[PDB]
Design an enzyme around this catalytic site. Structure first.
Site, mmCIF file in Angstrom:
data_model
loop_
_atom_site.group_PDB
_atom_site.id
_atom_site.type_symbol
_atom_site.label_atom_id
_atom_site.label_comp_id
_atom_site.label_asym_id
_atom_site.label_seq_id
_atom_site.Cartn_x
_atom_site.Cartn_y
_atom_site.Cartn_z
ATOM 1 C CG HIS D 54 24.405 -42.468 58.848
ATOM 2 N ND1 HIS D 54 23.752 -43.027 59.906
ATOM 3 C CD2 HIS D 54 24.651 -41.174 59.186
ATOM 4 C CE1 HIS D 54 23.570 -42.115 60.864
ATOM 5 N NE2 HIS D 54 24.084 -40.984 60.451
ATOM 6 C CG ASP D 57 23.819 -46.490 59.197
ATOM 7 O OD1 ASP D 57 24.838 -46.594 59.931
ATOM 8 O OD2 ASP D 57 23.034 -45.543 59.225
ATOM 9 C CG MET D 88 16.220 -37.958 56.501
ATOM 10 S SD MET D 88 17.616 -38.864 57.274
ATOM 11 C CE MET D 88 17.043 -39.033 58.936
ATOM 12 C CD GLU D 181 20.638 -34.521 63.677
ATOM 13 O OE1 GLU D 181 20.529 -35.147 62.616
ATOM 14 O OE2 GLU D 181 20.600 -34.894 64.882
ATOM 15 C CE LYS D 183 25.751 -34.485 70.258
ATOM 16 N NZ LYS D 183 26.248 -35.878 69.975
ATOM 17 C CD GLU D 217 19.130 -36.124 68.566
ATOM 18 O OE1 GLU D 217 19.530 -36.608 67.561
ATOM 19 O OE2 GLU D 217 19.746 -36.456 69.577
ATOM 20 C CG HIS D 220 21.441 -33.088 69.196
ATOM 21 N ND1 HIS D 220 21.695 -33.290 67.847
ATOM 22 C CD2 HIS D 220 21.811 -34.230 69.834
ATOM 23 C CE1 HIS D 220 22.150 -34.526 67.665
ATOM 24 N NE2 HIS D 220 22.249 -35.112 68.860
ATOM 25 C CG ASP D 245 16.677 -36.729 64.409
ATOM 26 O OD1 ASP D 245 16.054 -36.979 63.374
ATOM 27 O OD2 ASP D 245 17.914 -36.781 64.378
ATOM 28 C CG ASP D 255 23.496 -37.056 71.944
ATOM 29 O OD1 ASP D 255 22.327 -36.687 72.108
ATOM 30 O OD2 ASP D 255 23.903 -37.598 70.849
ATOM 31 C CG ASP D 257 21.037 -40.324 71.004
ATOM 32 O OD1 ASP D 257 20.733 -39.115 71.033
ATOM 33 O OD2 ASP D 257 21.812 -40.776 70.139
ATOM 34 C CG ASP D 287 19.192 -40.084 66.070
ATOM 35 O OD1 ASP D 287 19.676 -41.188 66.225
ATOM 36 O OD2 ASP D 287 19.979 -39.168 65.860
HETATM 37 O O1 LIG Z 1 23.109 -38.576 61.435
HETATM 38 C C1 LIG Z 1 23.088 -38.592 62.653
HETATM 39 O O2 LIG Z 1 24.101 -39.131 63.397
HETATM 40 C C2 LIG Z 1 23.919 -38.717 64.781
HETATM 41 C C3 LIG Z 1 23.952 -40.046 65.550
HETATM 42 O O3 LIG Z 1 22.594 -40.495 65.613
HETATM 43 C C4 LIG Z 1 24.863 -41.240 65.188
HETATM 44 O O4 LIG Z 1 24.957 -41.947 66.491
HETATM 45 C C5 LIG Z 1 22.606 -38.012 64.841
HETATM 46 O O5 LIG Z 1 22.437 -37.237 65.785
HETATM 47 C C6 LIG Z 1 22.110 -37.983 63.613
HETATM 48 O O6 LIG Z 1 20.913 -37.430 63.322
HETATM 49 MN MN LIG Z 2 19.984 -36.989 65.451
HETATM 50 MN MN LIG Z 3 21.722 -37.278 69.907
#
Ligand SMILES: O=C1O[C@H]([C@@H](O)CO)C(O)=C1O
Ligand SMILES: [Mn+2]
Ligand SMILES: [Mn+2]
Ligand SMILES: O=C1O[C@H]([C@@H](O)CO)C(O)=C1O
Ligand SMILES: O=C1O[C@H]([C@@H](O)CO)C(O)=C1O
Ligand SMILES: O=C1O[C@H]([C@@H](O)CO)C(O)=C1O
Ligand SMILES: [Mn+2]
Ligand SMILES: [Mn+2]
Ligand SMILES: [Mn+2]
Ligand SMILES: [Mn+2]
Ligand SMILES: [Mn+2]
Ligand SMILES: [Mn+2]
Lengths: 387, 387, 387, 387
Positions: D54, D57, D88, D181, D183, D217, D220, D245, D255, D257, D287
């Site tokens: 990002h 970041d 990306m 993306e 969610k 993802e 998600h 992802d 979520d 992860d 991710d």
């Molecule tokens: O850009 C993103 O942000 C969220 C997360 O990873 C931030 O914690 C996610 O699902 C992405 O692909």
């Molecule tokens: Mn993601």
């Molecule tokens: Mn996630």
């Protein structure tokens, strides 16, 4: 037709509820920190009866004994100024990094000892401030992976922790009881004692079971897709509903903590019907978070709707049970028969009764409709004020 | 590297599992009915140790005493011919229309009396055939609407039913114990005692708790999104794992009853690790349905994969716990410390210990990694045979 | 204050809804079969506008052409006698064992050809009876295991089936459009095109996309935990809400098909608000099953509550949008700004606008509350008639 | 038998993944912040091919243009030193309080303009660093309450935002495509475009659809209980799998992860089978978040297991498809027939074919078993290396 709370409705709020700054897993705080004494004053003006706290809500983590006594004196002055009570207190065993693998069931023994010492210090304060109930939410007790936690060993450590706490209270002569709060997941991948039934079962293995009950939360049972009024009924049946957390949740997802009445509104109706008809007399506590979309005006609006929604649902449930047409429907559906013993005549009489088997007409019995749908639409009409 | 069951693995199957004709809420049967004695023969050839039954699986509902005795004699000859056992039996209190509002908690009293008489008749048969465990699955006990069922009254009736059953067994001198099987929903909108924890809690209120344990089912706890190995660990901790139902489930949806190993495969691994390391010695029972896509060849293929998958997972779990590198990782993650008492020194010593609080270095403790991810990848490598 | 439907409210019901005999995965039928012409008469007396059918609801599977024409003539007389319409028809491609692996995406080619022939025969009948919409629910299209179905190949076959159906209609000159009904699971472990979004996306790859829209069902999106009003809004936005199925569902579990208003009551409110404010003009169709606890009196009570609940929610949603205090709250929450273009001034102007970035005061913007909680309690007060 | 990644495996990681400090809704950070250039170096040593970011970041929110250029130069030196790529990039439109009601669908117009300006600035940087794909995750686009968001208006604003972004790219002559993306929830109560199907459907209404695809993802889609391999198959079928992802999720909850391979391990197998057999050639992006139980050693252990698990599953899927006994089973289950056109002979020939209807033997067809269970146990044996 208004719905104004008074302190006689026993509405309570955690400091951390209206005090939630709006930090979520993906975003920074959207609101400034509230002083506890401001929250006490604002909640008293809305009609609340009292507040609750974690140790670390009231006294900043790492405070010196001098700062501690300061925080407590200011707090106590606000309670004296407002007539607000403190019916419940609890411990923060989840925020500090030291608790990343749990408090009472942390794999590191030193951490588990520290968790118990932190708890005991706050029980003494809770007693001083008059709390009757001490809540335990073990949000860090659990695992993300199967090899990380032996659950038999972890229940042994959990039992050990609660027994020592029970020993402490009885040795001090305190009039305080414990309430365990279940949650199925979040922040751990799975949390130990994940539902009301798991907490009730665990209690029966403690050395002094009569000291412990449950603090169920609306949104937490709904995170497992469970019927919250049904779990409360079982807690009532066991004599263990010491306290309750009221809020709303939209189904199986992260813990939303919406204001009470949001989420599953028919579940909220049936919950209020049950608390009122069972004569629950503990606090009506709101464990909710005003959405981070809101400013402080939206905070107090959300806290007020918690109370309003409880009072509207109380009125509709009471009108439902008082309606003669409902009482007739309840008989039509044989709720009166559900309340009668199946076999007060005893086993031998049951065995000898040919009308119970040999001569039981199963097709005539099968053919009787239960008339539940007419009953449920009367409940609907009452909830919506269409009656 | 093959994985052949023998009767010493204690694998069992319900008649209704391989016998499922494939009728679902939306479709007709895709397979013809199996004779019980054919199923006994085919399961013995695959290496099973025994079978289980509902009353109505073995003896057609409404059978005369002459037909009853016929069905039982043919069955008994097949068991004698194969060496198959019958370790468990249960009652059908769900199929017949008379049970549409439940058996033991039906609103109609006459139905509840009939349910108990039907149950008692099958306990006598179960004892005759040598069963040690009697299962109770109250799939019709619950509600689709809140006004249809007072749950306090319904738990009173449930307790009454199980107490009478306990009185019956003890008066007859039978060596049989009861196992309650939880399920959260389906076919009722919500089912009473919906999880393992709710069933364990209920048992503690019966007149003779030592007669009753649980029969948990993999897919049923997973229908509430719960961790099945964690719930089994709590059942083991309470001493109440009398029996178990093995199958697979893909998450929170209708009850799939897939063969064991399908569904959540890592949960299946951790389940087998726990049963084997706790030394569970009851039947390994499969409560599964071969998909209705299958013909009888696919039926026996599915039943065989149940057993195969258990044996593969047994081997991988054993290799996992026996690996020195794993034992080292377990110490790294302080699983050894989880098993030690928090405060064997007692409360007063805890209170006086400055290293537990006043001088506890919380930042040093916080900084220690748990090393769970390395542990969990070793478990992964062992499951996949990449080790 | 009553809530009487008339045929001008466009309420419709499937024959299979009030006709559901109450067979579930665990139990036998609790009600006798209804004659279609009895259901037509009873629904006309309750105020319905019309009925819908699967081929096999109206004409028994395997009927001769002589029996077929008989069934249709009796049906047609009941419609003439009542003024009931038939706005929608569909095909049963799920009950018969031949459909155990699907209709249009069955692995066996011969089955797929048979599915298309069975469909085309019923489109001709639907047109004869005046239906405007033909629904496709592919409840058998999917898999319990990953190797059983190549999903790219299966979408190819699904596209092929719908293109041939589109070719058929246009060659016959029929004025009929298709509506695909998503469902995420049950009776298959996973169903292809499992949500509204998957169905909308698929449609865009057909040869004649303008012939196809969606038939979303309340309980089906809620089986994936999705917001049903949000998915309808997206269907409306795409111009593809051809038809809708109304019912209730309690969260993520088996497909309950409760009467409309049961289940998630606030979702039902927001759904009615949206259909009414978007001016949806298709049928308000109930795809529900009266619980098997009920006799025929409870059947007609349940069908009547479907309609009642829609009309009560219509009144409350209209009072909500008409309230000046609500219109003021909507402005407070900037719903008016949501409806304005972000950058009607175009890209280059956006890029040159320093107030959009270089001089944008992000802290002042962040500090503005959204006032959503006050808005949502006004909606609550309106739903409950506390306003 | 080891499983060592090389940069030719196209494994990528977000800076925010191994960089996650472990702040959750209930707890403080457990790890210190990582320098991006340290993460680049450590990931290159583990065998990764590149990283993603990002804007915020890489460049601290509010950085001056002087600090910005500094951050970028240090970053670029680490990429030059390691040979790491940046395939990306994406925008943070979720952390800052200004985004509390969304970025592109915020009710406040000024916020929406600011969101677009912040995005466009980062597209220019992404292009400079060589990214081919620009991801959009609208985690703040949605609502906790029904009156807060008109979803038609919000899709209008979402379409407007993506069209302007498409105009920008084409005017600059950039070779970059967009990937949306989905969610379903979290951090908003419901998120707009909640699944792959909703994102695919939306894309078809943009002015230049060929510029946009999806970034699905794992965890998600599983938060809605959906089959992730099935949704990827539909994205592949539409030609829109621009990016992916990879991670793990245990069912319907917050979520998680988890590292890739954790969560639903059989879904992970079928996912890898599909990506490899469809010849997906984009990045294999992780991710994921190392659990907050871990120290930096556990961080790099977790990132390494992501890659390891992909490579083990790749080997097992390839052995599965290459096994002659599997190829035979696939024919037994008629996967070859699924790939053949249903009616290449066309509509009129279908209509005239008596073997498709008039003379189709539906009982013989119904009786054929699909043999899916034998196929699925071969897949199981291959996954477990029991084959
Ligand atoms: O850009 C993103 O942000 C969220 C997360 O990873 C931030 O914690 C996610 O699902 C992405 O692909
Ligand atoms: Mn993601
Ligand atoms: Mn996630
Ligand atoms: O003590 C508690 O903490 C959690 C949470 O409210 C903190 O956000 C909760 O559920 C309690 O009852
Ligand atoms: O007795 C039982 O019945 C159900 C079911 O298997 C019948 O389909 C089940 O879960 C049991 O253990
Ligand atoms: O055609 C349909 O069939 C299913 C079901 O109602 C049959 O029980 C449903 O969802 C439809 O819309
Ligand atoms: Mn909560
Ligand atoms: Mn709580
Ligand atoms: Mn089951
Ligand atoms: Mn079972
Ligand atoms: Mn349905
Ligand atoms: Mn439907």
């Amino acid at each position: 037709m208004n719905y104004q709370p008074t302190p006689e409705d026993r509405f309570t709020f955690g400091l951390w509820t209206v005090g939630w700054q709006g930090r979520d897993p993906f975003g920074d705080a959207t609101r400034r920190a509230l002083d506890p004494v401001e929250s006490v004053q604002r909640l008293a003006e809305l009609g609340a009866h009292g507040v609750t706290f974690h140790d670390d809500d009231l006294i900043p983590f790492g405070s010196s004994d001098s700062e501690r006594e300061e925080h407590v004196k200011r707090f106590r002055q606000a309670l004296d100024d407002t007539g607000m009570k403190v019916p419940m207190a609890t411990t923060n065993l989840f925020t500090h990094p030291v608790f990343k693998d749990g408090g009472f069931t942390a794999n590191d023994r030193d951490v588990r000892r520290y968790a118990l010492r932190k708890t005991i210090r706050n029980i003494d304060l809770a007693v001083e401030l008059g709390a009757e109930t001490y809540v335990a939410w073990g949000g860090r007790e659990g695992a993300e992976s199967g090899g990380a936690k032996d659950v038999r060993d972890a229940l042994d450590r959990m039992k050990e922790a609660f027994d020592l706490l029970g020993e402490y209270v009885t040795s001090q002569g305190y009039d305080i009881r414990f309430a365990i709060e279940p949650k199925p997941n979040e922040p751990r991948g799975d949390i130990l004692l994940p539902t009301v039934g798991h907490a009730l079962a665990f209690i029966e293995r403690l050395e002094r079971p009569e000291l412990y009950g449950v603090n169920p939360e609306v949104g937490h049972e709904q995170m497992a897709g469970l019927n919250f009024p049904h779990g409360i009924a079982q807690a009532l049946w066991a004599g263990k509903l010491f306290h309750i957390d009221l809020n709303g949740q939209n189904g199986i997802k992260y813990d939303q903590d919406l204001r009470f009445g949001a989420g599953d509104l028919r579940a909220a109706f049936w919950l209020v019907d049950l608390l009122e008809s069972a004569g629950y007399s503990g606090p009506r506590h709101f464990d909710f978070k005003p959405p981070r979309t809101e400013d402080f005006d939206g905070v107090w609006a959300s806290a007020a709707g918690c109370m309003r929604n409880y009072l509207i649902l109380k009125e509709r449930a009471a009108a439902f049970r008082a309606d003669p047409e409902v009482q007739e429907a309840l008989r039509a559906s044989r709720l009166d028969e559900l309340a009668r013993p199946t076999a007060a005549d005893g086993l031998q009489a049951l065995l000898d009764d040919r009308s119970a088997f040999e001569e039981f007409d199963v097709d005539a019995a099968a053919a009787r409709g239960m008339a539940f749908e007419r009953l449920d639409q009367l409940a609907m009409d009452h909830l919506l004020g269409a009656r």
